[PDB]
């Protein structure tokens, strides 16, 4: 009938989901026991390019590098350098592939035709103690037992530590203060995406 | 593990020894540089 | 082959100088949640006393 | 937030990057100071280019396209030199944003947190881009207020 | 007729009881005149304007 | 630019993270295309009137609803199916969808309480928050997937960490009423709330927080009062002033 | 004050200790190591600030690496060059780009910069140091004509 | 902490039904929507108030 049909489509469809739900475990085990999470997740390119990556964007327009350019690629000889310079990331790229290993031959050429050159021009008894307790000073201890310490010399070892710059070094002293969450201030914060794809 | 340190002692000691009794000129214009000159005794 | 190969040691009397805790107890814990909370604790009294002995230098 | 504003002044045009600024809370009494003090403005805005005016001409001729709100060929040549090509740039006139995105591929934003960060930059130009250039900022403005008049006008010296 | 803000607070103080005279103060025909005022006393910011 | 004439009247509406595609919620589950005005994927378990339907920020083919039968029904666009239901003791108003976990969820029930679940386990819920008077109507999370803020009948609006059963912190105003819906901002600094009294407010995320650009020496103080703050939590007296809120 | 101080002089203090293992430097000289480099610490982090003091700086660490580089070869010992040379290169780094950003209209001092990267810096950083050059003195077309000969 | 806890902003006004319906723009901070119980949908500007 048609019901228990659609209660069967209902059970394949909650075992593939949840296979697929099962590969962000570890991800969310990882996260929740991080010492600092960092936000937004996604990482940012550094400040300063290299110059090699800035010369890919430039273009022609005057006529000298238009004829500099027309007369460079009738030829074989490339514009930029494969190496140095990267790009985005059939048989016409493993060609270049073959580029690149002669290109990074070359530079080994040169590399160890230098050194060459390089070696060649180198060549109790009395005491009564007050059994009274100081009530005023009991009020400031700590009363309860607080989760998950099960016996109260286990919660007595956390405590014992100071934190304070006048008892800690200063590199010291910033590892026992990192914030647990750092955001900075005007970026946007998206959810995660696929472990950064 | 304690023949270990007390082997490396030595070798601070015998390295040490070398580099005092022989010096270049040119290691003592680069010392005082670094180290200034000053005499405690 | 390099002839010492650890990085350089701190002299144990002068770590123990900068220690708050109470090594002598034998406390009991069989709860997985009270250990990674006790060898934390460990950890950060550990790093804080070892950067102060190498500060010995300054004085 | 991370995104870049272009600046123009009678010395020259600037480009500068912001890293990061509390944008909701930005017209606040405390949070002001952010762009006032030159010390927080310094740590969240960078000058990472800048190409001055050779000469008089050059100034006033820039002047004159970017009243009408045209593209001139030396503001395009800093655009295109050091703009890496999902880019953001803050011009202050609505005109020259859209003449820029149809020229280049940038995305051009004239208003929101932009408007209060190229007062900053008009307010503390001055000591970034002080012993750049030759002739002073002061007297660059002061020089370039009389050509500019006498073409509107079409004066005559005689 | 005028409203001010120091006026209107006075009507959102009161609560749900008045919500009918909210309702009536919001109305298109009227002008809504600002004041920055640091308080909510409204007999004194009339005066001044006066 | 376009619009769609209708035969129900239809309660919420969603759109698609990263696909072009609405779906909005009626007397039964419809998924629809901004070139396509008719529904390409019509859903439905049962007879009811469907209050809410979200999107999952994370696995963006599932979906998450609440109906009238006090009953939360976890859907898929891909296989274009139900997944399971759920029915608790009241109507939930509103679902959320943690933005950090993708199988986690927050219902806002009608029983003065919050209830968080792991959608691969609904049998029981995580976490339950209680510490509401009224009816809460809507829940959002903050953007770093650690707190999240709810609004209830009553007028007040409170912000919990997931892995507590207690409100951090509870905001209200006497010119503030029955808030009903509230908005987390995408920078995990504000907090909006639209009320019925025609009032837009906004609230601060930490409300002892400096806003502006800090040097480095106000920094480094402010993190050392938060680790103080965390080490002697325990304490009798420093739990006195931290709890104490006016209400 | 001295706090940022402090901060950078223990973590100056490791390549000096591994210097002590190696047995290249003595006890009295590490001493007097951490002195002057205290001293010339003083110097850089006051409110008012000089071009001379960062210049002494650097002119400072480059004697000190020199003193260690004569010092290896006579020793023999060759391991452990990550800990202290490149420690030393990526502060002197930090220093220069610090007073760079102070002093854009120097270009005398970015040619320091410069000859320091080439002396001992990896070719990434040159590269980022030209380019950082030609983006605000665009208007000398030798500082072109250096980029290209490079 | 007590003394500085400030929590309060600001009050957007405009409406003249309750609010019912809110929606944060993804791509700008300051630009958010809302929907008021007689129809109208009102485009607020956060930073200018
Ligand atoms: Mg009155
Ligand atoms: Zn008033």
């Not at chain 1, 405590?159 to 590199?171: A, D, E, L, M, V």
């Not at chain 8, 405009?14 to 700008?28: F, M």
């Amino acid at each position: 009938n048609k019901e228990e049909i659609e209660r069967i489509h209902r059970e394949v469809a909650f075992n593939k989901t949840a296979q697929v739900l099962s590969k962000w475990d570890p991800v969310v085990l990882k996260n929740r026991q991080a010492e600092q999470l960092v936000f937004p997740l996604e990482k940012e390119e550094p400040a300063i390019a290299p110059i090699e990556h800035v010369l890919s964007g430039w273009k022609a327009r005057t006529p000298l590098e238009q004829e500099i350019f027309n007369l460079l690629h009738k030829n074989k000889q490339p514009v930029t350098d494969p190496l140095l310079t990267p790009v985005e990331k059939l048989e016409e790229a493993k060609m270049r592939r073959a580029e690149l290993q002669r290109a990074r031959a070359l530079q080994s050429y040169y590399e160890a035709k230098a050194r060459r050159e390089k070696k060649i021009k180198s060549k109790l008894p009395n005491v009564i103690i007050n059994e009274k307790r100081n009530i005023h000073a009991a009020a400031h201890q700590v009363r309860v037992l607080p989760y998950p310490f099960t016996h109260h010399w286990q919660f007595e070892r956390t405590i014992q530590t100071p934190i304070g710059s006048t008892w800690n070094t200063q590199r010291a002293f910033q590892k026992l203060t990192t914030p647990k969450v750092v955001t900075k201030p005007g970026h946007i914060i998206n959810p995660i995406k696929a472990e950064d794809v | 593990a304690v023949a270990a340190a007390e082997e490396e002692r030595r070798l601070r000691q015998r390295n040490r020894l070398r580099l005092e009794e022989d010096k270049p000129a040119v290691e003592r214009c680069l010392e005082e540089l670094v180290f200034g000159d000053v005499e405690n005794d | 082959q390099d002839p010492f190969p650890g990085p350089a040691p701190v002299p144990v009397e002068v770590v123990q100088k900068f220690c708050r805790i109470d090594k002598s107890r034998k406390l009991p814990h069989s709860k997985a949640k009270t250990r990674s909370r006790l060898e934390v604790a460990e950890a950060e009294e550990e790093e804080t006393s070892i950067k102060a002995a190498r500060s010995e230098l300054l004085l | 937030v991370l995104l870049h504003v272009l600046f123009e002044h009678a010395v020259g045009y600037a480009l500068l990057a912001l890293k990061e600024v509390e944008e909701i809370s930005l017209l606040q009494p405390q949070v002001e100071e952010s762009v006032l003090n030159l010390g927080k403005f310094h740590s969240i805005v960078r000058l990472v280019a800048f190409c001055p005016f050779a000469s008089s001409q050059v100034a006033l001729e820039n002047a004159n396209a970017v009243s009408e709100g045209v593209v001139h060929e030396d503001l395009r040549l800093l655009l295109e030199t050091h703009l890496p090509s999902k880019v953001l740039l803050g011009v202050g006139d609505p005109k020259i944003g859209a003449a820029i995105q149809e020229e280049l591929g940038y995305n051009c934003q004239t208003g929101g947190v932009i408007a209060e960060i190229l007062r900053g930059v008009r307010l503390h130009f001055h000591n970034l881009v002080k012993g750049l250039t030759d002739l002073s900022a002061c007297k660059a403005q002061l020089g370039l207020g009389h050509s500019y008049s006498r073409a509107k006008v079409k004066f005559n010296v005689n | 007729p005028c409203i001010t803000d120091c006026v209107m607070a006075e009507i959102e103080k009161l609560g749900q009881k008045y919500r009918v005279a909210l309702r009536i103060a919001k109305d298109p025909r009227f002008e809504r005149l600002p004041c920055t005022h640091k308080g909510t006393y409204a007999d004194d910011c009339l005066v001044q304007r006066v | 630019l376009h619009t769609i004439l209708g035969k129900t009247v239809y309660t919420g509406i969603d759109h698609h993270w990263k696909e072009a595609v609405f779906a909005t919620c009626g007397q039964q589950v419809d998924i629809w295309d901004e070139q396509r005005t008719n529904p390409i994927c019509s859903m439905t378990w049962g007879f009811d009137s469907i209050s809410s339907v979200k999107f999952n920020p994370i696995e963006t083919f599932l979906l998450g609803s609440c109906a009238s039968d006090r009953n939360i029904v976890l859907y898929d666009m891909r296989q274009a199916t139900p997944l399971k239901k759920v029915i608790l003791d009241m109507r939930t108003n509103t679902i959320c969808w943690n933005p950090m976990e993708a199988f986690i969820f927050t219902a806002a029930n009608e029983d003065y309480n919050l209830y968080t679940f792991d959608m691969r386990a609904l049998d029981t819920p995580v976490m339950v928050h209680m510490d509401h008077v009224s009816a809460v109507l809507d829940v959002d999370y903050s953007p770093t997937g650690k707190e999240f803020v709810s609004a209830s009948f009553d007028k007040s609006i409170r912000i919990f960490p997931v892995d507590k059963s207690r409100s951090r912190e509870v905001y209200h105003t006497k010119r503030m009423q029955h808030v009903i819906c509230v908005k987390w901002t995408s920078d995990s600094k504000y907090i909006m709330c639209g009320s019925d009294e025609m009032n837009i407010r906004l609230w601060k995320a930490n409300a002892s927080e400096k806003l502006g650009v800090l040097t480095s020496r106000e920094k480094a103080a402010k993190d050392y009062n938060q680790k103080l703050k965390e080490k002697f939590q325990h304490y009798p007296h420093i739990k006195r002033i931290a709890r104490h809120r006016h209400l | 004050m001295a706090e940022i101080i402090q901060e950078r002089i223990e973590d100056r203090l490791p390549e000096l200790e591994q210097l002590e293992r190696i047995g290249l430097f003595s006890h009295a000289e590490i001493k007097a190591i951490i002195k002057k480099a205290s001293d010339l610490e003083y110097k850089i982090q006051r409110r008012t600030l000089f071009k001379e003091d960062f210049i002494n700086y650097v002119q400072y660490e480059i004697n000190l690496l020199e003193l260690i580089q004569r010092r290896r070869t006579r020793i023999g010992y060759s391991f452990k060059k990550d800990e202290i040379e490149n420690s030393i290169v990526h502060r002197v780094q930090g220093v220069f780009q610090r007073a760079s950003a102070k002093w854009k209209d120097d270009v005398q001092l970015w040619l320091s910069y410069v000859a320091f990267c080439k002396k001992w810096a990896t070719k990434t950083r040159l590269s980022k140091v030209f380019s950082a050059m030609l983006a605000i003195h665009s208007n000398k077309p030798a500082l072109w004509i250096m980029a290209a000969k490079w | 902490e007590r003394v500085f806890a400030k929590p309060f902003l600001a009050s957007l006004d405009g409406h003249r039904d309750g609010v019912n319906c809110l929606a944060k723009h993804p791509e700008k901070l300051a630009t958010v929507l809302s929907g008021a119980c007689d129809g109208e949908v009102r485009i607020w500007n956060l930073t200018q108030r």
